[PDB]
């Protein structure tokens, strides 16, 4: 019974082929989840489920789409009473023995009760902030002078327990328009010690974003 | 004239020895700046210079001390009309060729107009994360299950232009108690789409905090 969902724009043929290839070559079942893109459907979903986010001028509609995709998958976890769901974004590369973690679930069931509130990150945890190149100020001693353009965190591969799905849906629902930030920044900022929400990290990681 | 200042609690002997060792071994001049700590002095400085921060329950007094230390160094930059000042925290480790960047400033003077508003980060630029080991949930397939938390991003090594010192002093002075946030968030994250204020990052970095290397 399938736990792995890959968020992917329906027309992203090159990414989907790479995902198919990777999952089939390790014999890991999965389904694509058709990512929300700028569209009437996304507009409607924002208005109905996250009215606060629809108003947030600080995010691109694409960022709102990615957020909505994660959020609806969490909702699926609740609605279908799944113990956990494993979410990916469609540019991950699976590491070597990933099938021991993703084709089989007993290792998780033996370790956690799924009403516990946790995420288990499967992707790398050493991630650079997003830097832009610039051409006007020359490098010095073979070091570039780049411009910081955002704090970037991975939401490309993680297990979320039913408990954590409930917690995150409630959290995202309660955020005001002013508090909205990209999903990765919201989730990054939730990773603190004074809460019931616990974030575990697989170390070393078993997948990584392509670029 | 010295541009490098290392923020350090006056009694922090082990850190100061490590800083002395590192800077002297690469022949980089610097001065210690006595960090503000929870104390009468910090309380008084908060009340006089940053009254809205004294009330801010979202920062610990220690964090307010670190903030006050940076802030008074920016004020020094303004009072002394320095083109730039280069600030470190007392846990940095200098990279290999750090002296090419820190012992002299000509490479900066030929590159930037210091009336422009910018900070140039010198330290590593990974998302600020820490892993706690735990033994109660067993590893699987030779992979540990660690506990992951976020921490503040580094303010442990950066060059700040006079323009940016003026801008940040003005900004911090105007923030209400509710708007106060960690220094890193105010300096870096919140200014990403500011009209004049730029944050540059030296890539690859030339220094790293003792804790981030680990
Ligand atoms: O309009 C969009 C654009 C992207 N995505 C999803 O966002 C994820 C991350 O996309 P990408 O790697 O392009 O973004 P980045 O990692 O650059 O933030 C992918 O799963 C996409 O399918 C989405 O739901 N809606
Ligand atoms: O009350 C204090 C405690 C610390 N610091 C300074 O804050 C900087 C960073 O301290 P640390 O590396 O302990 O913390 P982090 O990098 O986690 O913010 C150092 O220069 C300390 O001297 C300070 O100004 N006041
Ligand atoms: Mg990506
Ligand atoms: Mg992302
Ligand atoms: Mg933070
Ligand atoms: Mg700090
Ligand atoms: Mg530090």
PDB file of C-alpha atoms in Angstrom, chain A residues 20-168:
ATOM      1  CA  UNK A  20      10.343   7.016 -13.019  1.00  0.00           C
ATOM      2  CA  UNK A  21      13.819   5.800 -13.890  1.00  0.00           C
ATOM      3  CA  UNK A  22      15.101   6.254 -10.341  1.00  0.00           C
ATOM      4  CA  UNK A  23      12.237   4.710  -8.452  1.00  0.00           C
ATOM      5  CA  UNK A  24      11.825   1.742 -10.860  1.00  0.00           C
ATOM      6  CA  UNK A  25      15.604   0.989 -10.831  1.00  0.00           C
ATOM      7  CA  UNK A  26      15.421   0.575  -7.004  1.00  0.00           C
ATOM      8  CA  UNK A  27      11.959  -1.076  -7.194  1.00  0.00           C
ATOM      9  CA  UNK A  28      10.315   1.581  -5.060  1.00  0.00           C
ATOM     10  CA  UNK A  29       6.643   2.119  -5.680  1.00  0.00           C
ATOM     11  CA  UNK A  30       5.328   5.679  -5.803  1.00  0.00           C
ATOM     12  CA  UNK A  31       2.661   7.895  -7.303  1.00  0.00           C
ATOM     13  CA  UNK A  32       2.972  11.323  -8.855  1.00  0.00           C
ATOM     14  CA  UNK A  33       0.975  14.071  -7.205  1.00  0.00           C
ATOM     15  CA  UNK A  34       0.059  16.685  -9.872  1.00  0.00           C
ATOM     16  CA  UNK A  35       1.599  19.896  -8.515  1.00  0.00           C
ATOM     17  CA  UNK A  36      -0.510  23.015  -8.222  1.00  0.00           C
ATOM     18  CA  UNK A  37       0.548  25.691 -10.742  1.00  0.00           C
ATOM     19  CA  UNK A  38      -0.648  29.244 -11.381  1.00  0.00           C
ATOM     20  CA  UNK A  39      -4.195  28.536 -12.466  1.00  0.00           C
ATOM     21  CA  UNK A  40      -7.843  28.810 -11.531  1.00  0.00           C
ATOM     22  CA  UNK A  41      -7.529  25.536  -9.608  1.00  0.00           C
ATOM     23  CA  UNK A  42      -4.721  26.888  -7.407  1.00  0.00           C
ATOM     24  CA  UNK A  43      -6.571  30.161  -6.908  1.00  0.00           C
ATOM     25  CA  UNK A  44      -9.653  28.219  -5.842  1.00  0.00           C
ATOM     26  CA  UNK A  45      -7.696  25.920  -3.504  1.00  0.00           C
ATOM     27  CA  UNK A  46      -5.968  28.912  -1.879  1.00  0.00           C
ATOM     28  CA  UNK A  47      -9.279  30.680  -1.367  1.00  0.00           C
ATOM     29  CA  UNK A  48     -10.965  27.620   0.162  1.00  0.00           C
ATOM     30  CA  UNK A  49      -8.127  26.072   2.248  1.00  0.00           C
ATOM     31  CA  UNK A  50      -5.549  28.846   2.882  1.00  0.00           C
ATOM     32  CA  UNK A  51      -7.261  32.197   2.327  1.00  0.00           C
ATOM     33  CA  UNK A  52      -4.384  33.857   4.250  1.00  0.00           C
ATOM     34  CA  UNK A  53      -1.872  32.695   1.636  1.00  0.00           C
ATOM     35  CA  UNK A  54      -3.897  33.896  -1.393  1.00  0.00           C
ATOM     36  CA  UNK A  55      -3.419  37.468  -0.126  1.00  0.00           C
ATOM     37  CA  UNK A  56       0.306  37.117   0.601  1.00  0.00           C
ATOM     38  CA  UNK A  57       2.096  39.291  -1.919  1.00  0.00           C
ATOM     39  CA  UNK A  58       5.500  38.087  -0.632  1.00  0.00           C
ATOM     40  CA  UNK A  59       5.263  34.685  -2.445  1.00  0.00           C
ATOM     41  CA  UNK A  60       5.141  33.949  -6.162  1.00  0.00           C
ATOM     42  CA  UNK A  61       2.138  31.963  -7.278  1.00  0.00           C
ATOM     43  CA  UNK A  62       4.535  29.099  -8.009  1.00  0.00           C
ATOM     44  CA  UNK A  63       5.633  29.172  -4.366  1.00  0.00           C
ATOM     45  CA  UNK A  64       1.993  29.181  -3.359  1.00  0.00           C
ATOM     46  CA  UNK A  65       1.480  26.181  -5.645  1.00  0.00           C
ATOM     47  CA  UNK A  66       4.317  24.217  -4.042  1.00  0.00           C
ATOM     48  CA  UNK A  67       2.893  25.065  -0.585  1.00  0.00           C
ATOM     49  CA  UNK A  68      -0.576  23.943  -1.622  1.00  0.00           C
ATOM     50  CA  UNK A  69       0.810  20.675  -2.963  1.00  0.00           C
ATOM     51  CA  UNK A  70       2.485  19.749   0.347  1.00  0.00           C
ATOM     52  CA  UNK A  71      -0.530  20.923   2.284  1.00  0.00           C
ATOM     53  CA  UNK A  72      -3.017  18.839   0.262  1.00  0.00           C
ATOM     54  CA  UNK A  73      -0.784  15.796   0.659  1.00  0.00           C
ATOM     55  CA  UNK A  74      -0.810  16.318   4.444  1.00  0.00           C
ATOM     56  CA  UNK A  75      -4.591  16.571   4.182  1.00  0.00           C
ATOM     57  CA  UNK A  76      -4.630  13.284   2.258  1.00  0.00           C
ATOM     58  CA  UNK A  77      -2.689  11.700   5.148  1.00  0.00           C
ATOM     59  CA  UNK A  78      -5.468  12.760   7.555  1.00  0.00           C
ATOM     60  CA  UNK A  79      -8.454  11.989   5.258  1.00  0.00           C
ATOM     61  CA  UNK A  80      -7.302   8.536   4.319  1.00  0.00           C
ATOM     62  CA  UNK A  81      -6.107   7.788   7.887  1.00  0.00           C
ATOM     63  CA  UNK A  82      -2.585   6.897   6.712  1.00  0.00           C
ATOM     64  CA  UNK A  83      -0.032   6.262   9.480  1.00  0.00           C
ATOM     65  CA  UNK A  84       2.528   8.297   7.559  1.00  0.00           C
ATOM     66  CA  UNK A  85       3.134   9.641   4.062  1.00  0.00           C
ATOM     67  CA  UNK A  86       6.489  10.130   2.404  1.00  0.00           C
ATOM     68  CA  UNK A  87       6.750  13.250   0.232  1.00  0.00           C
ATOM     69  CA  UNK A  88       9.229  14.100  -2.472  1.00  0.00           C
ATOM     70  CA  UNK A  89       9.759  16.889  -4.949  1.00  0.00           C
ATOM     71  CA  UNK A  90      10.406  15.871  -8.531  1.00  0.00           C
ATOM     72  CA  UNK A  91      14.050  16.807  -8.730  1.00  0.00           C
ATOM     73  CA  UNK A  92      15.426  14.458  -6.003  1.00  0.00           C
ATOM     74  CA  UNK A  93      18.103  11.924  -6.702  1.00  0.00           C
ATOM     75  CA  UNK A  94      17.844   8.761  -4.670  1.00  0.00           C
ATOM     76  CA  UNK A  95      20.988   7.536  -2.968  1.00  0.00           C
ATOM     77  CA  UNK A  96      22.238   3.998  -3.095  1.00  0.00           C
ATOM     78  CA  UNK A  97      20.281   1.890  -0.588  1.00  0.00           C
ATOM     79  CA  UNK A  98      17.159   4.077  -0.601  1.00  0.00           C
ATOM     80  CA  UNK A  99      14.894   1.069  -1.247  1.00  0.00           C
ATOM     81  CA  UNK A 100      15.534  -0.247   2.327  1.00  0.00           C
ATOM     82  CA  UNK A 101      13.795   2.912   3.554  1.00  0.00           C
ATOM     83  CA  UNK A 102      11.178   3.622   0.870  1.00  0.00           C
ATOM     84  CA  UNK A 103       9.905   0.271  -0.481  1.00  0.00           C
ATOM     85  CA  UNK A 104       9.458  -1.121   3.083  1.00  0.00           C
ATOM     86  CA  UNK A 105       7.797   0.456   6.160  1.00  0.00           C
ATOM     87  CA  UNK A 106       8.392  -1.867   9.150  1.00  0.00           C
ATOM     88  CA  UNK A 107      11.618  -0.085  10.144  1.00  0.00           C
ATOM     89  CA  UNK A 108       9.437   3.017  10.810  1.00  0.00           C
ATOM     90  CA  UNK A 109       6.541   1.198  12.461  1.00  0.00           C
ATOM     91  CA  UNK A 110       8.901  -0.495  14.912  1.00  0.00           C
ATOM     92  CA  UNK A 111      10.512   2.849  15.814  1.00  0.00           C
ATOM     93  CA  UNK A 112       7.533   5.248  16.114  1.00  0.00           C
ATOM     94  CA  UNK A 113       3.896   5.411  16.924  1.00  0.00           C
ATOM     95  CA  UNK A 114       2.342   7.470  14.185  1.00  0.00           C
ATOM     96  CA  UNK A 115       0.273   9.647  16.435  1.00  0.00           C
ATOM     97  CA  UNK A 116       3.616  10.979  17.660  1.00  0.00           C
ATOM     98  CA  UNK A 117       4.261  14.342  15.988  1.00  0.00           C
ATOM     99  CA  UNK A 118       7.332  14.112  13.779  1.00  0.00           C
ATOM    100  CA  UNK A 119       8.949  14.577  10.423  1.00  0.00           C
ATOM    101  CA  UNK A 120      11.892  12.468   9.375  1.00  0.00           C
ATOM    102  CA  UNK A 121      13.980  14.285   6.777  1.00  0.00           C
ATOM    103  CA  UNK A 122      15.482  11.992   4.175  1.00  0.00           C
ATOM    104  CA  UNK A 123      17.412  14.556   2.143  1.00  0.00           C
ATOM    105  CA  UNK A 124      20.720  16.269   2.874  1.00  0.00           C
ATOM    106  CA  UNK A 125      20.948  18.750   5.731  1.00  0.00           C
ATOM    107  CA  UNK A 126      24.024  20.666   4.530  1.00  0.00           C
ATOM    108  CA  UNK A 127      22.339  23.140   2.189  1.00  0.00           C
ATOM    109  CA  UNK A 128      23.703  26.505   1.017  1.00  0.00           C
ATOM    110  CA  UNK A 129      21.641  29.639   1.076  1.00  0.00           C
ATOM    111  CA  UNK A 130      20.676  30.819  -2.422  1.00  0.00           C
ATOM    112  CA  UNK A 131      23.361  33.087  -3.924  1.00  0.00           C
ATOM    113  CA  UNK A 132      23.169  35.042  -7.243  1.00  0.00           C
ATOM    114  CA  UNK A 133      26.178  35.740  -9.405  1.00  0.00           C
ATOM    115  CA  UNK A 134      27.007  39.329 -10.312  1.00  0.00           C
ATOM    116  CA  UNK A 135      29.312  40.649 -12.992  1.00  0.00           C
ATOM    117  CA  UNK A 136      30.041  44.274 -12.062  1.00  0.00           C
ATOM    118  CA  UNK A 137      32.347  43.691  -9.088  1.00  0.00           C
ATOM    119  CA  UNK A 138      35.190  41.352 -10.071  1.00  0.00           C
ATOM    120  CA  UNK A 139      36.226  38.282  -8.050  1.00  0.00           C
ATOM    121  CA  UNK A 140      39.293  38.402  -5.843  1.00  0.00           C
ATOM    122  CA  UNK A 141      41.781  35.546  -5.288  1.00  0.00           C
ATOM    123  CA  UNK A 142      39.423  33.176  -7.101  1.00  0.00           C
ATOM    124  CA  UNK A 143      36.518  33.991  -4.789  1.00  0.00           C
ATOM    125  CA  UNK A 144      33.323  35.327  -6.198  1.00  0.00           C
ATOM    126  CA  UNK A 145      31.367  38.132  -4.643  1.00  0.00           C
ATOM    127  CA  UNK A 146      27.837  36.817  -4.845  1.00  0.00           C
ATOM    128  CA  UNK A 147      24.612  38.406  -3.746  1.00  0.00           C
ATOM    129  CA  UNK A 148      22.462  36.716  -1.091  1.00  0.00           C
ATOM    130  CA  UNK A 149      18.958  36.314  -2.548  1.00  0.00           C
ATOM    131  CA  UNK A 150      17.257  33.922  -0.127  1.00  0.00           C
ATOM    132  CA  UNK A 151      17.451  31.389   2.642  1.00  0.00           C
ATOM    133  CA  UNK A 152      16.633  28.073   1.030  1.00  0.00           C
ATOM    134  CA  UNK A 153      15.727  24.855   2.844  1.00  0.00           C
ATOM    135  CA  UNK A 154      14.866  21.450   1.362  1.00  0.00           C
ATOM    136  CA  UNK A 155      11.318  20.064   1.361  1.00  0.00           C
ATOM    137  CA  UNK A 156      12.262  17.602  -1.324  1.00  0.00           C
ATOM    138  CA  UNK A 157      12.215  14.338   0.697  1.00  0.00           C
ATOM    139  CA  UNK A 158      10.593  13.627   4.055  1.00  0.00           C
ATOM    140  CA  UNK A 159       8.384  11.305   6.017  1.00  0.00           C
ATOM    141  CA  UNK A 160       5.537  12.943   7.904  1.00  0.00           C
ATOM    142  CA  UNK A 161       3.536  11.147  10.581  1.00  0.00           C
ATOM    143  CA  UNK A 162      -0.206  11.553  10.831  1.00  0.00           C
ATOM    144  CA  UNK A 163       0.373  13.464  14.063  1.00  0.00           C
ATOM    145  CA  UNK A 164       2.669  15.898  12.296  1.00  0.00           C
ATOM    146  CA  UNK A 165       0.279  16.273   9.343  1.00  0.00           C
ATOM    147  CA  UNK A 166      -2.438  17.417  11.778  1.00  0.00           C
ATOM    148  CA  UNK A 167      -0.008  19.740  13.523  1.00  0.00           C
ATOM    149  CA  UNK A 168       1.271  21.334  10.306  1.00  0.00           C
TER     150      UNK A 168
END
